[PDB]
Nucleic acid binder design. Structure first.
Lengths: 236, 324
RNA sequence: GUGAGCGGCAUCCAAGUUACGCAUCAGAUUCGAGACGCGAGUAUUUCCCGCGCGGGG
């Protein structure tokens, strides 16, 4: 029902993957339970869970942000943020780290017409053949709409939010593509989409997640702020 | 002897009504639960009966300044601006009990409970100051009646009368003022600013962690308070029970020097500033652009001057003395 | 056929007259509606994971 978003103001835009790597690195050894809980690890092992992650990372314009889902997510972010703040203060002795703590109510109500919803970061590259299928809407709609529907239903079930039984979505398109890597020296990269616009006949309150593999910082979007239509101020 | 003072305030008047009333956004009094809620400080109001061009009498709230506040304002203005310089010229020192009694009507919370000798009663009542207010350990009835600052309004016609109907205001005269409280944490962006702070950025981050961990109070507070809007005209009514010339002159001097004092509340925000527009003495206007002056008022000023240049602290120390 | 049998405590009457809950008290001091929402990325891989299928950069 409640989503907690915490932003650490480091002063520079850090990509979410390196952010998660470094926050893992800072908490090595001290308070192992916090590390296991924050990294989405099975108790007793360091492996991650295939299930939807309750721990969330995102790329803030001024830094990186922690997102908790549900009471468990809220509780973990609440007892976690002082520790990561202390670690960041320890590592960066000559910079002030600022913490912004804001909560979003999560609500999804139906609506007999559609609204323009978009995201900056979709994980859509599965096969190279499907990548060229985006020229025709009909061929590429099936897997994209299926991905959106499954992502929405699984995140709703994870957060326990009621959703209508009659959601239909049609895709519009994206702005461009981008490449992302595990490490700067890694030779493995994936393709995402920026401005992937799709129309849904329902309202989405608060911040929302779509796609899969979200903990590394993909598929987060504030649907509520997008409805304000502040995307007009994009020019040079 | 009735005194009516036409007061126009050039800054909002803020007399806080006791109690934690809560407001939402867009100024809804006592909002339905669930919406955002913030503590609102309501301005002091008195319910009065008035007919709003309907003919039926009904009780409606009216934002006023309580009469006790105006009485204390008159007392303080008189003391600071008239009596205290007179005592300082003669280098006469008031005892601590005398000072407390003159400034709050009593030197302690325990009244004496016994009456006064007649000579002492008349001596204290004939005094230019103590006669007006009275008080003391043994209770004394002052000569001064101070009424509340009633705003001239369609709700005040049944109270003040139709004499000042030309200055009435139809709509409401209260507004909500919103205030914040910002932490220093937001305005730190560089350690160069924090060169004045102990421990530097490390200590600052430690303090912010303490704030997020165990403080909850904290230095962040969004709140609001209701103020009476500026420019509304007020009527102040003062009555005296058979005064001497010196007491009337003292009251007139206090009215002359009253404009230098605020009415109530909002010292930080310059609230309570006013200008005395018209002073009426027994149905006759004695006010002048300079102030309270004229041939009809010369005798009062002469009498109060003759009382001031020859007064001492003996009366005050006798008045404050307790018989227990 | 009980020392039984028979037998109004009843009439009339004022609790009333005078008296002040009143005198004396500052809701005052402090705080910014101004900050925040991915506009910077440059392409093919493995031990194990939920379990043919679903997955970890």
């Amino acid at each position: 029902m409640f989503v907690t978003q915490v932003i650490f103001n480091m002063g520079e835009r850090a990509y979410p993957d390196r952010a998660r790597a470094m926050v893992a690195e800072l908490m090595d050894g001290v308070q192992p339970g916090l590390v296991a809980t924050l990294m989405n690890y099975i108790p007793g092992t360091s492996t991650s869970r295939t299930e939807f992650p309750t721990v969330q990372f995102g790329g803030a314009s001024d830094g990186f942000c922690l997102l908790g889902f549900g009471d468990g997510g809220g509780a973990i972010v609440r007892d976690a943020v002082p520790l990561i703040h202390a670690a960041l203060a320890r590592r960066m002795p000559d910079r002030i780290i600022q913490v912004e703590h804001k909560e979003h109510s999560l609500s999804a109500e139906a609506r007999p017409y559609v609204l323009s919803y978009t995201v900056p970061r979709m994980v859509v590259q599965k096969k190279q053949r499907h990548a060229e299928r985006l020229l025709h809407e009909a061929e590429g709609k099936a897997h994209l709409e299926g991905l959106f529907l499954r992502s929405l239903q699984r995140q709703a079930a994870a957060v326990g939010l009621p959703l209508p039984e009659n959601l239909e979505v049609e895709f519009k398109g994206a702005v461009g593509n981008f490449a992302a890597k595990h490490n700067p020296n890694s030779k493995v990269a994936y393709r995402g989409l920026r401005g992937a616009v799709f129309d849904v006949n329902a309202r989405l309150g608060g911040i929302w997640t779509a796609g899969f593999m979200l903990s590394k910082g993909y598929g987060q979007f504030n649907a509520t702020h997008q409805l304000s239509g502040a995307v007009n101020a994009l020019s040079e | 002897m009735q005194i009516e003072v036409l007061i126009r305030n050039i800054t909002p008047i803020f007399s806080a009504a006791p109690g934690s009333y809560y407001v939402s956004l867009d100024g809804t009094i006592n909002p339905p639960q669930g919406a955002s809620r913030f503590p609102l400080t309501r301005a002091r109001t008195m319910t009065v009966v008035a007919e709003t061009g309907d003919g039926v009498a009904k009780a409606v709230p009216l934002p006023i300044v309580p009469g006790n506040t105006m009485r204390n304002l008159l007392r303080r203005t008189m003391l600071k601006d008239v009596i205290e310089p007179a005592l300082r010229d003669k280098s006469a020192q008031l005892s601590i009990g005398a000072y407390a009694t003159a400034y709050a009507g009593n030197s302690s919370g325990n009244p004496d409970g016994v009456p006064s000798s007649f000579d002492e009663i008349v001596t204290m009542r004939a005094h230019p100051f103590l006669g007006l207010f009275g008080g003391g350990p043994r209770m004394l009835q002052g000569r001064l009646m101070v009424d509340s600052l009633y705003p001239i309004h369609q709700f005040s016609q049944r109270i003040i009368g139709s004499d000042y109907i030309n200055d009435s205001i139809k709509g409401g005269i209260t507004e909500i003022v919103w205030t914040r409280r910002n932490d220093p944490i937001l305005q730190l962006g560089s350690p160069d600013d924090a060169a004045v702070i102990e421990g530097g950025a490390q200590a600052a981050n430690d303090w912010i962690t303490s704030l997020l961990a165990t403080t909850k109070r904290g230095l962040k507070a969004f709140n609001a308070h209701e103020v009476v809007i500026a420019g509304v005209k007020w009527l102040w009514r003062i009555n005296v029970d058979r005064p001497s010339e010196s007491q009337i002159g003292l009251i007139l001097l206090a009215l002359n020097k009253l404009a230098n004092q605020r009415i109530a509340g909002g010292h930080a925000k310059d609230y309570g500033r006013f200008v005395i527009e018209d002073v009426i003495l027994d149905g006759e206007s004695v006010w002048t652009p300079s102030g309270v002056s004229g041939q009809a008022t010369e005798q009062f000023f002469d009498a109060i001057a003759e009382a001031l240049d020859g007064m001492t602290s003996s009366e005050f120390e006798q008045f404050a003395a307790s018989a227990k």
